[PDB]
Structures are given as structure tokens and as C-alpha cells.
């Protein structure tokens, strides 16, 4: 249930 | 019953590089707009996550090399593993990890 702003960080 | 905690230990004496080798992601409350967390989006297949055996994708983060990440938002979890899995973890080669997966 997000916000359809999310986003990915790669680590 | 479907939920399970999982306490890892990745080493990333190569990923060092790529962080640990996995991209994070987490979620919103729809109402209350809280952050629900950090979710690995893709584990990048060859990194010390894969390498691990024991990071799957879908796995909720909840402590990182001994620090939760509960009392702060995504991006500042995320950013805190960040740090602490290429500063503390990597110090020694690998970091600790704590994750939470439903059973499905």
C-alpha cells in the first residue's frame, strides 16, 4: 500500500 | 502465523564495492503515510547477499549490524544499512543483517 512514490536504492 | 524473523550475516569482503549486492525499496501506510519499512526489491545474483544463501527477495528489514531501523524512515533505513554494511560490517568483512518474511 504505497504512496506510488516509492523507489529502490542499490546497496 | 505466517511470519518468521531472519538473522544473517553477509560478507561482502568483495562487495565491499556494491554495498552487499541487493537493491532495497519500502512502503507507505496508505493512510497514515508512516513508512513500513525497507523490502529487498532484487538481490543482485552474485553479491554478498546471494552469496549469503540466505537473502531472498521480499524480505523485510528490521536491524542492520546490530541496529534497527524501525525508529526511522525508509530512505534513512536503507541509508542507515548503507552505512552500516559498508563502514561497520565491512570493517570486519560482513555485516549483520535482520530480516522478516511471511511464509508463502
Known amino acids: 500500500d504505497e504512496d ?3 523507489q ?3 546497496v | 502465523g505466517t511470519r518468521e524473523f ?6 561482502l569482503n568483495d562487495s565491499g564495492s ?3 549486492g541487493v537493491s532495497v525499496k519500502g512502503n507507505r501506510s496508505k493512510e497514515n503515510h508512516a513508512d513500513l519499512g525497507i523490502f529487498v ?3 543482485i545474483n552474485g553479491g554478498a ?3 549469503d544463501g540466505r537473502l531472498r527477495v521480499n524480505d523485510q528489514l528490521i536491524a542492520v ?5 524501525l525508529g526511522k524512515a525508509n530512505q534513512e533505513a536503507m541509508e542507515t544499512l548503507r552505512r552500516s554494511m559498508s563502514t561497520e560490517g565491512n570493517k570486519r568483512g560482513m555485516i549483520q543483517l535482520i530480516v522478516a518474511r ?3
Open chain 1, 4 to 6: 506510488q512514490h516509492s
Open chain 1, 8 to 10: 529502490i536504492t542499490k
Open chain 2, 6 to 11: 531472519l538473522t544473517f550475516e553477509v560478507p
Open chain 2, 18 to 20: 556494491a554495498g552487499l
Open chain 2, 41 to 43: 526489491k532484487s538481490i
Open chain 2, 49 to 51: 547477499a546471494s552469496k
Open chain 2, 65 to 69: 549490524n546490530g541496529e534497527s531501523l
Open chain 2, 102 to 104: 511471511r511464509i508463502s
